[PDB]
Amino acid sequence: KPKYQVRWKIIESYTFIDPTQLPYNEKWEFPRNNLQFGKTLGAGAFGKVVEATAFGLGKEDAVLKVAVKMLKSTAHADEKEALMSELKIMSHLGQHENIVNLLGACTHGGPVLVITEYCTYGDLLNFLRRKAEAMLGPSGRPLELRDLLHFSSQVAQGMAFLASKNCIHRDVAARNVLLTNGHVAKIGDFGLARDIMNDSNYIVKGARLPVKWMAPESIFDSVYTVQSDVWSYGILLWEIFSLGLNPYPGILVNSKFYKLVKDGYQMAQPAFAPKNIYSIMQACWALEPTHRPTFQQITSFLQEQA
Ligand SMILES: Cc1cc2cc(Oc3ccnc(Nc4cccc(CS(=O)(=O)NCCN(C)C)c4)n3)ccc2[nH]1
Fold this sequence. Notes:
This is Macrophage colony-stimulating factor 1 receptor. It is found in: Cell membrane. The chain has 306 residues and is α+β, with helices and mostly antiparallel strands. The protein has two domains: 97 residues, Phosphorylase Kinase, domain 1; 175 residues, Transferase(Phosphotransferase) domain 1 (Transferase(Phosphotransferase), domain 1, Orthogonal Bundle). The chain has eight helices and eleven strands. Strand 5 and strand 6 form a beta hairpin. The protein is globular, with a radius of gyration of 19 Å. The N and C termini lie far apart (44 Å). The structure holds Sulfatinib (UKI). The site of Sulfatinib has 16 residues, from strand 2.
């Protein structure tokens, strides 16, 4: 039996902020009657994300497509509190080009609605898989290596922003990266729109955990830091440069798997990774967390390669 819990954490000193104690800045408030909902984009056991037209949003009074996060009508008070905490974290962090940004919220007069940017091309994992199939078909445009480097660089920039705000993501993976206009990548947390209870990428342990993405110190000691996010980012790189294979393909998560990772087992070079991109992956998988690259080092390196 899983609970709906706040994914991201903010470091205080590791001491973490209690997000329930953060303030909600009413500058974000938007009238719920000024949303016209469209299709549901995804739904899980606790809520869903629905596209909508927002009328008069922002300083320019834009009329635009947005995405709206919401809980099920039957949500417990504990879950409504978690959605508010997620809202407060987004307001605390500020905006960046390579994250899925907060645009507004509806907190009065009904259930809490969190309004974010809408990303026209959906998640990166499905995008890469569908593009791979489109490219094999002949036997819109095809992917090239520079596209993969751009996606990778853009995610690293968004993560460098989060790290600069002392924010830990804890579920870095291609399924949590979206592509927007111009195929620009943005990192976010879309667990609410994901069917996690029936998702083979989350393993029951202790909690449903994305074990194949997790650093050994997270698996064994439940330690989460920016450096454990860097490990997960290395797994994301492997996803990108394999065009969306599952990590550790074909390997069952069991005691042997946990031991192998703790002892230094690493995936082999993906089919489309240049040697030095695989070397970055290996660097992200250093067993000593402080030996891993920073997101700024990753960003600068990948920007150069692109
Ligand atoms: C794996 C997954 C991540 C995820 C994130 C979600 O929250 C968000 C948040 C912001 N944006 C979007 N944009 C968005 C999400 C899913 C589908 C689409 C439309 S599409 O499939 O890429 N192209 C349209 C296809 N049809 C019209 C032909 C956009 N999802 C919503 C559902 C999600 N599913």
